[PDB]
Ligand binder design. Structure first.
Ligand SMILES: [Cs+]
Ligand SMILES: [Cs+]
Ligand SMILES: [Cs+]
Ligand SMILES: [Cs+]
Lengths: 189, 189
């Protein structure tokens, strides 16, 4: 996907309003300048130039009258998703690295981010548990058949919950952010 | 790059102001909703979902008090650049398909779009002419060494012109739009 000293970035805004984003390198140099709407970007990506094979990037985010500074390390030739979320009376971000594995024909791949205060089990297969840790825990990737998943079985941990995933397309990898079960759907590059 | 019934799109705005873009499918269905600044997007891309392996997409563009409608055909698993340009007292767009060839280590790849009213020869190699037809003609791709090209030899067709390309990075493919020689630099996904 990305060339030497380059990365791909997808910005995911889970805040209740627009978020202004900049990403700086080591010398007050903007690698990305982006305005992101609430519950965007599901299918928009940017290419960032690094100064080395590895770097700590400076993510500056404006939300209302706040301008936060969050640092996250990256490695060349990788794709990342920056998840922006409301953190108390402020905002914070988490950076997740995406997989380079292409689903087999007839399959799609899915992953979860759990924002709730309780650990979740996504029960797609009963002989293959899919754990999603509380407070922004990230699940392992899982390959599934392409198709519609309107009522997926979800446990926490003596409680049962249903989750709608919508239509999953052939050869596509999805990220589901569990918000309330309710989940926001984004697509990996 | 893109999965079955998907494309990548990069929007290149050569107009003097912001351009609002929508791209529709066959049933008043938005595949992309984008606001693009003047001389952007050099490194931002979107994924579009097609309804078939091939489709004619409806590109709607707003520039000041104009809302134009331009149709361009696409094929699945391809990457495209939409070049928006001022066309008299209006705007128009052209869609170009990008190559899937990765430059060898130590190399970069480049391509030209000539907006001038005269045919151009980009003389990088004297034994390998690089023609760029007038009135938005597209040149063939050319692999070159990574490095700085501040004064490239450019002919039209008994006249000599110099062109600055800046720094070309390892493994990257570039699009140069010749505007006035003066050229705007964009990067293929
Ligand atoms: Cs975008
Ligand atoms: Cs920092
Ligand atoms: Cs963007
Ligand atoms: Cs149309």
């Amino acid at each position: 996907m990305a060339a030497s000293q380059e990365i791909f970035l997808q910005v995911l805004n889970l805040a209740d309003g627009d978020v202004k984003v900049t990403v700086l390198g080591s010398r007050n140099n903007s690698l990305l300048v982006e305005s992101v709407s609430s519950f965007q970007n599901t299918t928009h990506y940017s290419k960032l130039h690094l100064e080395a094979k590895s770097q700590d990037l400076h993510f500056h985010l404006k939300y209302n009258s706040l301008s936060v500074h969050n640092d996250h390390s990256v490695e060349e030739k990788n794709c990342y998703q920056l998840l922006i979320h409301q953190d108390g009376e402020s905002i914070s971000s988490m950076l997740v690295k995406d997989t380079g594995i292409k689903p087999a024909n007839g399959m799609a791949a899915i992953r979860f981010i759990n924002t709730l205060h309780k650990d979740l089990n996504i029960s797609l297969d009963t002989d293959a548990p899919l754990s999603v840790g509380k407070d922004y825990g990230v699940s392992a990737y899982r390959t599934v058949l392409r198709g519609k998943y309107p009522a997926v079985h979800c446990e926490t941990e003596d409680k049962v919950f249903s989750l709608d995933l919508g239509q999953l397309d052939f050869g596509t990898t999805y990220l589901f952010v569990i918000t309330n079960l309710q989940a926001w759907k984004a697509e990996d590059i």
